[PDB]
Amino acid sequence: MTPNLQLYNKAYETLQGYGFPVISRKEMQQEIPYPFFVIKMPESNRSKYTFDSYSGDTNLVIDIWSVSDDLGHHDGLVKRCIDDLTPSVKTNDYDFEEDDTNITQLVDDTTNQELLHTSITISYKTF
Amino acid sequence: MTPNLQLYNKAYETLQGYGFPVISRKEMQQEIPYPFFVIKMPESNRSKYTFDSYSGDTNLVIDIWSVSDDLGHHDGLVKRCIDDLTPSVKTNDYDFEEDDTNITQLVDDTTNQELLHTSITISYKTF
Amino acid sequence: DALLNQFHDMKTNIDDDVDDILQENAKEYVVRAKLKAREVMNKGYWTGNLSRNIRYKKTGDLQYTITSHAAYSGFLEFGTRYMEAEPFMWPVYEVIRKSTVEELKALFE
Amino acid sequence: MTEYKIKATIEASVAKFKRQIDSAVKSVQRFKRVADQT
Amino acid sequence: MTEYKIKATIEASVAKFKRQIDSAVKSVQRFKRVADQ
Amino acid sequence: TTLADVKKRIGLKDEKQDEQLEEIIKSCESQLLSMLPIEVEQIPERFSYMIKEVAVKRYNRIGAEGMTSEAVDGRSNAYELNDFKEYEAIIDNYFN
Amino acid sequence: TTLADVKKRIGLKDEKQDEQLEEIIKSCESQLLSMLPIEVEQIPERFSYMIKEVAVKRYNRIGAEGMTSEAVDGRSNAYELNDFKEYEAIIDNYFN
Amino acid sequence: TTLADVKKRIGLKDEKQDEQLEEIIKSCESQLLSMLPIEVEQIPERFSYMIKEVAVKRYNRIGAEGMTSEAVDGRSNAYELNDFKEYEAIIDNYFN
Amino acid sequence: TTLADVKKRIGLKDEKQDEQLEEIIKSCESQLLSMLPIEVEQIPERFSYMIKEVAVKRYNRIGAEGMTSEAVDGRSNAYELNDFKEYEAIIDNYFN
Amino acid sequence: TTLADVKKRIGLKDEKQDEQLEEIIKSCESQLLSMLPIEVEQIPERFSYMIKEVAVKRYNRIGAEGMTSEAVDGRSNAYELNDFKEYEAIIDNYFN
Amino acid sequence: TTLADVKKRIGLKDEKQDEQLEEIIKSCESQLLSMLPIEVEQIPERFSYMIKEVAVKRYNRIGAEGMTSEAVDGRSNAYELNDFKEYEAIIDNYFN
Amino acid sequence: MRYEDRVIFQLEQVATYNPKTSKKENTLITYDAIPCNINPISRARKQLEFGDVKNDVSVLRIKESISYPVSHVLVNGIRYKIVDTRIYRHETSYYIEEVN
Amino acid sequence: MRYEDRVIFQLEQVATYNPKTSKKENTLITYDAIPCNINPISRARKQLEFGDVKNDVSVLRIKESISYPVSHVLVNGIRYKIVDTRIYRHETSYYIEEVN
Amino acid sequence: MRYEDRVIFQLEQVATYNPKTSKKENTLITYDAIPCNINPISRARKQLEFGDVKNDVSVLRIKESISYPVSHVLVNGIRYKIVDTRIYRHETSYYIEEVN
Amino acid sequence: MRYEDRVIFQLEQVATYNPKTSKKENTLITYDAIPCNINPISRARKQLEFGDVKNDVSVLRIKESISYPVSHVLVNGIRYKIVDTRIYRHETSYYIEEVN
Amino acid sequence: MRYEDRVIFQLEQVATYNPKTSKKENTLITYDAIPCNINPISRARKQLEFGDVKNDVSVLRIKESISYPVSHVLVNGIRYKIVDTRIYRHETSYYIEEVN
Amino acid sequence: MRYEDRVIFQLEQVATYNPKTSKKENTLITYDAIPCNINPISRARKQLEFGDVKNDVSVLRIKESISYPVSHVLVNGIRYKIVDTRIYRHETSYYIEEVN
């Protein structure tokens, strides 16, 4: 596997454990209760790093949707994810070390309802 | 809680004290007199800072809407917000220190009325 | 680093991108109206001279005007003192509005 | 008879976007000129 | 002559982008000072 | 008729328009009583419903009394030639 | 007729329109009994279905009692010129 | 007729509308029995199909009883003036 | 007729509409046998094709039995005023 | 006629529709033989072309038997009222 | 006529439509020979041009033999009500 | 108009955000059902940032008018936000869009 | 035209900004009510930067014309800005938009 | 309507992604064929990022309605996704687009 | 329809690129001419990156249908790519655009 | 056409820029008034970079034609720039827009 | 059609650029005048990078057709570039735009 798929799977193994639905993209016949997690496949740069290994930058985005009725709970999900996926993730072939996390929240009215949309981006150095 | 929500709550607990209405977004059935505050959830960068802590950049935006009939009062609200939220904000888990504040104003005619729209950005280094 | 080229190209070309989408939606408006006319004007006197006379023109820059040139066509769109209405351009307004807006969005999304 | 024709019109405005783009362009040219001394 | 109309007016919120690039400019200039002074 | 039965048919439960409906009913009664034979001093109870029916017609026609059609921005009405036309025949046939 | 028999055909299953339907049915009965010869005291059961059918026609027409056409935000109706027109040929043919 | 044969023709295999169809059929039977000569106490079996045919017409017309035409946002019906018009001639010709 | 002979013309090759076509054909036979003189007990084979042709007309009209026009999402139909109209000139001319 | 001559005129070189055309031709032959004088057991060869002409008309009308018009996205047709109308006059004039 | 004389007028210069034009011409000859009096065995050469003209009319109409009008992707045709109409006034006037 | 269908009006009453508990719990007022007339149900594909949903844009009609404030309707078991309301002399017409 | 409704015209007279007190307080001239004809009220969703508002875009009609300058109208208890005025021979027609 | 053509409805039932095996294998439920009416086949050029494809955007009509959930149709040997379904009183109309 | 004009259908059969010779030479299958009906020739200005060209966007109609695969047509001495084909019961209609 | 209104034509004759005095003072030629026919006055909101102005976009019609060059018209006390002039056999039609 | 006006066709024949002299002097072939029919003259404002010009977009019609290549027309003393030519059976129709 690429590091992309290794990390993406490790992220599902985490988030899918919370008991909220986790999806890559909602299909039309599929009913999703709020709150729910979107997760998007990592980008990955690679370059030579030592005479014996590559290293690179892998960027993971998970994306949390909830109704705005209770913000403390939504922020509880955001904190619970960041606490589960940092500072480092180990998998079979790759080690991931957090370099940055960026949290951005929007209030979204696209759907005739006031939803909270939090994007969590995490930049991992990888080796 | 994240620093985002900790700051956002401290911002409400300040601005909501002036008696003018404070909102994150206006809903259609909700009547808001002028002047009023829109307040928008902070962004946060987080990264390793010492062997013992993270640190990061938390970006607050508050957004003051008034009719243009009296500019001195509108500016008085601007200055009152800045003087309350700077130089430092302390809360339970986090400290915030003003890195910079940027004030920008527009004359807004979108609503068939000449409004003043002031945007106040404050960039807090956070520890 | 060369980003100025991208902004320069946007400044230079998007005029024609908007003009093309307007022209395409104007043509589609006429085609759909020519069909919709026979779709409802079927009380049985049809020569189709109305449908021979739905046209459009580029009446201004980034402005296309569709026009039903047949003289009685208003009496058909709106009805009369003696006839029920059989509206034929209004149902196309409801279509081409959506296509135009979503295609202009897709030019910038 | 009377010439009871019907019109429908589709039209667009770009001139505001044009000026917003000019504003962004000259801001990036400001960056260009300071990077040249750096 | 009844006229139906569709108008499209095109926008870009460049006031954020300007502030970003200006912040970058002002940040770079600190380096130039640190080098020369 | 009563007002209350026209009121019930048109489903109008408030009182905001009783001033208009009382004039409409007074008008319909006067017209029907004009259509009877000259001797007949009272509207036969056999016909008492016509007053109600035409009153509802007139209630709907408020703001379009002189007009064969009314339109604005996709609200459109077209009105029949004569409120009593259906009943001119019945009144005739009853007296002849 | 009963109200329930009209209620069944128009598919209603609640009470929220009874006060209108009652007055509509009462009007249809009065009208039909106006069309019969003067000596007739009651609508004969042979014709009872007419009271139902017109009661449905009028139920649809509600809010349009005088109007030949009605457009409301893309919903367009056009109405038959006379509710009892079909039945005049039966009533007259029956008594004469 | 049975209900089941109208049901079969209109291809309606569930039971969600039997309450309406039974009223429609009861209405069509009553009307046809009104069109016969006054002496005739029973619908001739030669005509038993008309009840079914008109019932299907009426099933289609549900929600448009009094309306000559009906349209909304891509769906339009226009209706013929009289359900029994084709059969008035046949019933006449059979009794004359 | 057989069902199969109608089935062949409309190009059907499966069983999924037999219960409708059966009732359509049975209705057409009843109607045509209503149009012949009273002494006629059976449609003469000379006319058997009529039952087929009208059975096809009605198959097209299915879901529009009362409607002069039918528009559904950019499909639209307009229907002939009377299915047997052509054949009245043959039937009458044959018996008289 | 043969099938092959209708086939040749309509330019249809494959065999995918012979099942329909054979029924159409059988129908046209039966109808023409119905329009002749009652005594006439055989279609005169002078008229043998009518079967072909009407069969082509009907070939075109496949899917529009009862419909005076059909419209669909990009395509629409309008049909003449009676396939044999042109020939009713010739058949008449020949026998009278 | 010859085929070549029709072929020349419609501007054809190849063989790819001969089997249609042959049947069209053969049908036109049969029809015209149906319109003449019973004693006439052949179309007199005085009328031979009619067979050509109608053969061209039908060539245009190919694929629309029953249709008042035909619209196909912005191409719209409407057809004369009767191909021989002009010539009936000549044929009848000549024999009578 | 045939006014066959029954609509339940609602007002979702917007609460003030409480920073001590991180909640802004709204409350729904809900009214008795009214006879109305409504367009046939659509179930269009609408294409949001997270994916497809079955949207429904529609118009609903009632005779005369209602005394009381409203914001949403529930009808046919679908809940809609009112996005326009158009006030004729004897009739009211509401443009409504499904939420979600 | 049925001229049933009563409109109050207004002129909002723009004052010069006073830099010593930071005020530019306008003043409203307001006129006697005139008989007019107006479209049925809409209350469309309009979607501003700060959120939704109930807008109303409309046309109002008066017989002949008025001698005096105007800028806003108040009618049905809604205040509108005039955004076009069309001057026919015997009739004047004003396009108006609600403020807010 | 002539309901000549036969349509097969399908529901493609979306499975939960399995991170132990990197699979999210859906499953198709498929129903008995129904008589339908459908527009003539188009085969338009559609121009995707990887190139041209023969698309078909179409409408399909059925008498009354179906009890069961659906998502795709197979008809004329082409498989379509349902993108709108419009529900009239006695008739159901599906807007469908070919997949690929 | 008058089917006067003669069209030659073609299929340009796409070859698989050969990296040993840097060629992907396609091959044309070309069919016997068919009677068709075609709109009057246009010669519009089309404005490509390298400059103006005389384009022609047109529709062509044939009775019943053809058994065999096609991709281009040659008619009136102009070669077109087929960009839509629309399959009615007794008639086929092709949308075509000139190449170059 | 009723040619009631009287229009004054003008030509604003463009001078060449004088760099020694920084002036390019144009000069106006102005003609005798002509009988014309003109649309009813509009006073639309036009929304320039500095703000709102009362614009007027209109059409003016004259019998036969004028011998002489023109560029602006003054009518009803408003000055317009001619932006199109259309030349029929017996009639001339000018599209005109107010300046400012 | 009344074919009253006289049109002069032209072909501007494009020369190959000469790098020794930095010239690519074209040459005009010009033909005998033909009877034609033409729309009334427009003089629209067209707004180029350097400023306003009096543009004229128009249509010109001639009976049957011309044997010879063309590119521009001169008529009414205005020179146009041909931008479309539409070839009916007995008639040719040219869409033309003024140069400058």
Tab-separated table of N, CA and C in Angstrom, chain F residues 1 10 15 33-34 42-46 48 53 63-64 66-67 72-73 80 84 86 91 93:
chain	number	residue	atom	x	y	z
F	1	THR	N	-80.857	36.158	3.331
F	1	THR	CA	-80.165	35.122	4.151
F	1	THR	C	-79.605	35.748	5.410
F	10	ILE	N	-67.952	30.411	2.625
F	10	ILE	CA	-66.642	30.895	2.200
F	10	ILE	C	-65.575	30.689	3.267
F	15	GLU	N	-63.884	38.552	11.432
F	15	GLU	CA	-64.887	39.578	11.177
F	15	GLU	C	-64.356	40.736	10.342
F	33	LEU	N	-84.741	40.358	-6.113
F	33	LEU	CA	-86.082	40.903	-5.988
F	33	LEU	C	-86.460	41.796	-7.156
F	34	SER	N	-85.484	42.310	-7.901
F	34	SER	CA	-85.809	43.035	-9.125
F	34	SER	C	-86.138	42.107	-10.280
F	42	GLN	N	-92.055	39.536	-2.262
F	42	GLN	CA	-91.119	38.797	-1.425
F	42	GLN	C	-90.407	37.742	-2.252
F	43	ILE	N	-89.127	37.537	-1.965
F	43	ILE	CA	-88.357	36.485	-2.621
F	43	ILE	C	-88.865	35.129	-2.145
F	44	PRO	N	-89.343	34.264	-3.033
F	44	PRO	CA	-89.784	32.938	-2.594
F	44	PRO	C	-88.652	32.197	-1.908
F	45	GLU	N	-88.982	31.504	-0.820
F	45	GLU	CA	-87.953	30.753	-0.116
F	45	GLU	C	-87.350	29.659	-0.982
F	46	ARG	N	-88.066	29.219	-2.016
F	46	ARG	CA	-87.476	28.292	-2.972
F	46	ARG	C	-86.201	28.854	-3.580
F	48	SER	N	-84.200	31.183	-2.020
F	48	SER	CA	-83.357	31.868	-1.050
F	48	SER	C	-81.882	31.529	-1.223
F	53	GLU	N	-75.447	32.063	-3.234
F	53	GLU	CA	-74.501	31.686	-4.277
F	53	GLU	C	-73.905	32.906	-4.953
F	63	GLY	N	-62.787	43.696	-6.286
F	63	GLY	CA	-61.718	44.319	-7.035
F	63	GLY	C	-61.713	44.037	-8.516
F	64	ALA	N	-62.729	43.348	-9.037
F	64	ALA	CA	-62.806	43.036	-10.457
F	64	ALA	C	-64.233	43.159	-10.983
F	66	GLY	N	-65.884	45.453	-12.710
F	66	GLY	CA	-66.036	45.864	-14.092
F	66	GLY	C	-65.235	45.111	-15.125
F	67	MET	N	-64.509	44.075	-14.723
F	67	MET	CA	-63.402	43.511	-15.485
F	67	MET	C	-63.706	42.088	-15.920
F	72	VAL	N	-51.684	39.856	-12.580
F	72	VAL	CA	-50.435	40.457	-12.120
F	72	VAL	C	-49.439	39.374	-11.713
F	73	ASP	N	-48.290	39.338	-12.387
F	73	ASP	CA	-47.126	38.545	-11.974
F	73	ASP	C	-47.470	37.098	-11.626
F	80	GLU	N	-66.777	35.122	-15.560
F	80	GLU	CA	-67.951	34.886	-16.385
F	80	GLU	C	-68.716	36.175	-16.666
F	84	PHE	N	-75.967	36.226	-12.615
F	84	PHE	CA	-77.277	35.592	-12.519
F	84	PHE	C	-77.664	34.784	-13.749
F	86	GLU	N	-77.088	31.812	-14.853
F	86	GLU	CA	-77.599	30.468	-14.599
F	86	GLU	C	-79.017	30.498	-14.057
F	91	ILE	N	-85.614	31.168	-12.771
F	91	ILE	CA	-86.666	32.092	-12.364
F	91	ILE	C	-87.743	32.182	-13.434
F	93	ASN	N	-88.491	29.829	-15.711
F	93	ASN	CA	-89.217	28.571	-15.804
F	93	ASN	C	-90.167	28.390	-14.634
